[PDB]
Design a protein around this ligand. Structure first.
Ligand SMILES: Cc1cc2nc3c(=O)[nH]c(=O)nc-3n(C[C@H](O)[C@H](O)[C@H](O)COP(=O)(O)OP(=O)(O)OC[C@H]3O[C@@H](n4cnc5c(N)ncnc54)[C@H](O)[C@@H]3O)c2cc1C
Ligand SMILES: Cc1cc2nc3c(=O)[nH]c(=O)nc-3n(C[C@H](O)[C@H](O)[C@H](O)COP(=O)(O)OP(=O)(O)OC[C@H]3O[C@@H](n4cnc5c(N)ncnc54)[C@H](O)[C@@H]3O)c2cc1C
Ligand SMILES: Cc1cc2nc3c(=O)[nH]c(=O)nc-3n(C[C@H](O)[C@H](O)[C@H](O)COP(=O)(O)O)c2cc1C
Ligand SMILES: Cc1cc2nc3c(=O)[nH]c(=O)nc-3n(C[C@H](O)[C@H](O)[C@H](O)COP(=O)(O)O)c2cc1C
Ligand code: FES
Ligand code: FES
Lengths: 261, 311, 311, 261
């Protein structure tokens, strides 16, 4: 009931190559609070029973709406079918879900580092919006494969106390290369580093900032139930390999390189 | 908390207020779904498989979607008998003392099953055991216990001798002929049967050309397999004199009634929980009106009618 | 009438312009679907099963819907060898002389199969034989030839000795282990394999409480079974050195490429024709662009890559 | 192409208890001609692959629209999902299909008998419209289980040279009983009798009018392909039991009691 609702599509349009931005309105928005949680979306096709986990990009309490940015596959995929929904359509949503990014213990003194990659960038927007209030120092490094898949630049740049840096693998925009390059360029002592993106990018980030305790890493995984019962989304606890961490319930965001909740 | 006699069914060790039971591996130990609704609404619960020692399971990806179904190669991940005996089952007994629990048991050899069966019955809330015999038998080259009548029978006999609650045996659908295995399991002492466990499937990633599942193969479940379950249930129903709890692609009240037409006495719901967290209570709520439509006075009556009008 | 080398594949007795072949029993003898499009667009056709004598088939209802699939208990209805030799095949040869035909053969005993195999090859357009071994063996209590390696092998040996075109054997998925049957069929002389035939399913009518199909049981087909087909194909692909034509729930070009990732050399499309009459030509049209996306230069190349990168 | 089209829903409303009337517009209408043909409709659900065979109730050439009357099942059936479609929606249609009712060899002299039952009545409307032109003598006997499922009365009564008689099993409208009762009541030599309805009704009709050669009976059956290839919809030829008659291709309307094409 509070974790499931037939939300209403306010709007939906493609904002990048095969990347759609959907705006959903519903009572579930009220239960949102921490950035990094996700929604488990049911595909409007009876032959596709598994829900699609999609990070919440941002939300508007007063408006009672949340926004998501997702990449679609071909005509045989679930996201493709979701991208067809127009304003007024209903979407079966389960959420908000998971442990999001910690922001409470953040102060206008410490300097925050935010690194995003590809479709892992969306959740970082709400995080940024959140941190903006603390008036802390924010440096956002965003990476993309190409210019046609770059997203949220406008949203990020238009945030005070935020220094945005963008890179593309083929250098079709911003700096040439992967975010990893822009990362080595920064000069300052980071207090907390929030990250979300491709696996190779997370490994690179958590590798450069190994000694950093306030390292928040958002993970992805194949899911089924989305609530912690089936154990499909497991990871080994770097702290205890025997202990299994569930991306959907324990995560998606965790502490430590090889991962620690 | 209003009960309904039309829905209650009595099976060995199981006095169910209604026939709906979440299937093993699809409800964990009830701790996650308990957040969505009151578990007492359920008839019972088949908790995930328990093994002697802890099991982490198979590497990931562990799941994949299929047309009207899904593949899973979880690998029977669980904390082990000890933790289940001291933490998981007690949680259920503390919060839902009146809810009977069906304990799913797995293992790599007969010795493992025996150990779990003998112990798990110590839990006050565990009212029956469901043997997951789709596991590879290391003592038989890796062959699943459920694909050999004689091997399955010996396993059931040994387990029956040490169990303190009625013993149910979950049959595998991955066999040429299910009748021999069912007859042998019944002859060996099984108090009841549950069926079916998953079929075997594989999905390939077109970009990598590799299997989607790390384990390559996975168990196929969901509505896609319901016709196979109904076929096997109906087939076994004609040759056994012990009850059958049916499962495989049940997603609504109509499917539950179809399970009964095939010969089932109770109905488990697995995969459907992932799509709709409230599927079980919705089904329970819907059953009475559906029964009214199809002239069914009660499920107990239906079970008897189907049993005598074999057709 | 533009051909494409990237799509052509060479199999025993089969020089296909593309890999798409309507599956047996889902295209009749091509006379109905020929009204929708030009059959030459196809790579080949697996016509419905031919039996020595005419067969009317099973009583009705003969079909039922399932989640992402269907059940059929047609019963192999056909006009018989004579009529097929004198009327049906000649029609195809007269209107589509260049289209190779795969003749599906069925029977109740080895003698029946032998009779059809020896004769059917007389047709100029019949370029290969596909043995439907999911039929009950009256000489073995009704057991399907496809559920016994040794029985299947003897059938294949006898048939191979009298056939004038390459012999393909359609394997049944209704078995505990498919490897033995596939190895034995290959050892017996089979030129290739096709898989899979249908799974077994049942649906019940809630109002009558009776099976929907008069035959009670029916063969399950459609997207629902694709994961099972892929699993078995991939499994057999690791242990045989003859080609496999894959089928089971193929509904689009993505599925065809998935069949190739599993080890198939060509792909049959059955049930999907009922949903979309133009499914085969659509698939053929779509393949090239999909191959471009997945870096596939040609299907012949893909078959070789998959064969060497067993993974 | 000429046998398949994404038609457009012009309108759809429930006209009787669980009975919906859908109006479809498309180029396929142009190919219609004889009454009694049907359409093979794809359900808007990916898990339901088999098309639903529905008789054409009538059509409007100039308008380029055809109409159908169909009964729905519960929320788990295909027709139920079809009944939800609103104006503007698209429907994947295959057709027109089958051998319809013969009307060419009919003259204003001969007296035509038309007997319909339940959901078998719809196709008889176009037949009636067709025959109205010949100015022949038409007597329509329609039967229903109850009043809440009666349909097309207005349409039929408003046809010249047509004497409509309606009956209901529980007698909640018109004459009490089954059409079979109204049939025995008629007094005149019928030249041709067109019929469509429940099996028991067809058996009764073809039984009373055994000696009538111009007996046209429309049949129903479980179908798959809908074009004559799969052989799911078979019937035994009363003329030759060995010969199989396919309701979808040879039928739906045939000649003789036990059936003859
Ligand atoms: C916590 C979390 C948050 C996410 N947030 C976003 C986001 O904000 N934006 C975005 O574009 N993507 C996001 N993703 C990835 C997105 O869930 C997959 O891209 C999408 O599920 C693939 O579905 P499909 O319909 O495209 O493909 P299909 O191939 O039809 O999917 C079939 C099955 O595979 C699963 N699946 C396929 N590949 C993926 C993989 N890459 N990721 C996870 N499961 C997989 C599907 O979820 C489904 O169960 C997130 C994933 C997780 C776990
Ligand atoms: C030539 C022909 C013309 C018809 N014309 C009409 C008409 O004008 N109006 C009308 O209301 N009905 C008509 N019917 C009956 C209609 O096709 C079935 O009522 C409908 O297909 C059942 O689908 P479902 O979605 O309700 O049920 P489901 O139970 O979901 O159907 C699943 C499968 O069973 C088939 N099916 C179920 N029962 C029926 C049976 N009674 N009839 C045929 N197949 C069955 C479905 O078509 C489908 O393949 C006609 C049937 C035929 C063969
Ligand atoms: C994710 C998952 C985990 C499950 N693990 C078990 C298990 O631990 N023990 C067991 O007997 N069956 C297990 N099964 C099989 C189911 O309990 C059930 O027999 C099968 O999935 C059919 O029902 P369904 O179609 O409703 O899921 C599992 C199935 C799934 C999909
Ligand atoms: C209506 C129907 C008739 C078919 N009859 C035959 C047949 O005559 N011979 C044969 O080998 N297989 C027959 N099959 C099996 C198919 O050719 C095929 O092996 C199976 O249906 C898998 O492919 P599909 O999912 O694409 O239909 C039949 C299947 C159906 C659904
Ligand atoms: S999706 Fe089931 S535990 Fe994470
Ligand atoms: S529906 Fe296939 S022959 Fe009639």
């Amino acid at each position: 009931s509070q974790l499931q609702e037939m939300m209403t599509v306010v709007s939906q349009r493609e904002v990048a190559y095969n990347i759609f931005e959907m705006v959903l309105k519903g009572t579930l928005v009220d239960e949102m609070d921490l950035p990094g949680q996700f929604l488990h979306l049911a595909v409007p096709n009876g032959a596709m029973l598994l829900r699609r986990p999609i990070s919440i990009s941002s939300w508007d309490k007063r408006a009672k709406t949340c926004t998501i940015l997702y990449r679609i596959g071909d005509e045989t995929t679930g996201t493709y079918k979701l991208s067809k929904l127009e304003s007024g359509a209903k979407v079966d949503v389960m959420g908000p879900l998971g442990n999001g990014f910690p922001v409470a213990e953040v102060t206008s003194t410490d300097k925050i580092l935010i690194i995003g990659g590809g479709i892992g960038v969306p959740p970082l927007y709400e995080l940024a919006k959140q941190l903006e209030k603390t008036g802390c120092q924010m440096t956002i490094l965003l990476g993309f494969a190409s210019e046609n898949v770059k997203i949220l630049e406008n949203e990020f740049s238009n945030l005070k106390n935020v220094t945005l840096k963008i890179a593309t693998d083929d250098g079709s925009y911003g700096t040439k290369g992967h975010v990893g390059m822009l990362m080595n360029e920064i000069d300052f002592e980071v207090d907390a580093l929030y990250t979300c993106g491709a696996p190779a990018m997370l490994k690179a980030v958590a590798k450069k900032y190994d000694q950093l305790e306030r390292l928040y890493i958002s993970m992805e995984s194949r899911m089924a139930c989305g609530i912690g019962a089936c154990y499909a989304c497991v990871e080994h606890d770097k702290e205890d390999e025997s202990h299994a961490l569930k991306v959907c319930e324990d995560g998606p965001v965790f502490l430590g390189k090889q991962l620690s909740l | 908390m209003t009960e309904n006699n039309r829905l209650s069914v009595k099976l060995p060790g199981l006095d169910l207020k209604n026939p709906i039971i979440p299937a093993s591996g699809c409800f964990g130990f009830g701790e996650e779904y308990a957040k969505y609704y009151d578990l007492n609404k359920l008839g019972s619960i088949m908790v995930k498989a328990t093994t002697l020692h802890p099991r982490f399971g198979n590497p990931t990806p562990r799941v994949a979607e299929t047309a009207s179904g899904m593949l899973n190669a979880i690998g029977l991940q669980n904390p082990g008998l000890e933790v289940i005996m001291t933490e998981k089952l007690p949680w259920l007994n503390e919060n839902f003392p009146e809810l009977p629990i069906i304990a799913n048991v797995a293992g790599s050899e007969e010795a493992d099953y025996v150990a779990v069966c003998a112990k798990i019955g110590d839990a006050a809330n565990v009212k029956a055991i469901e043997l997951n015999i789709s596991c590879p038998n290391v003592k038989h080259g890796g062959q699943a216990f459920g694909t050999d009548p004689e091997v399955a029978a010996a396993l059931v006999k040994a387990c029956k001798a040490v169990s303190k609650v009625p013993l149910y045996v979950k049959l595998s659908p991955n066999v040429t002929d299910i009748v021999p295995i069912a007859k042998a399991v019944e002859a060996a002492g099984a108090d009841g049967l549950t069926m079916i466990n998953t079929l075997m499937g594989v999905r390939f990633d077109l970009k990598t050309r590799q299997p989607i599942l790390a384990n390559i193969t996975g168990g196929l479940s969901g509505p896609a397999i319901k016709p196979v379950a109904l076929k096997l249930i109906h087939q076994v129903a004609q040759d056994v004199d012990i009850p059958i709890i049916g499962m495989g692609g049940v997603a609504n009240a109509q499917d539950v009634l179809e399970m009964y037409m095939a010969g089932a006495s109770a109905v488990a719901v697995g995969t459907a929980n992932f799509a709709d967290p409230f599927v079980c209570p919705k089904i329970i709520d819907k059953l009475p009106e559906l029964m009214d439509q199809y002239r069914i006075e009660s499920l107990e009556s239906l079970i008897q009618e189907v049993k005598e009008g074999k057709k």
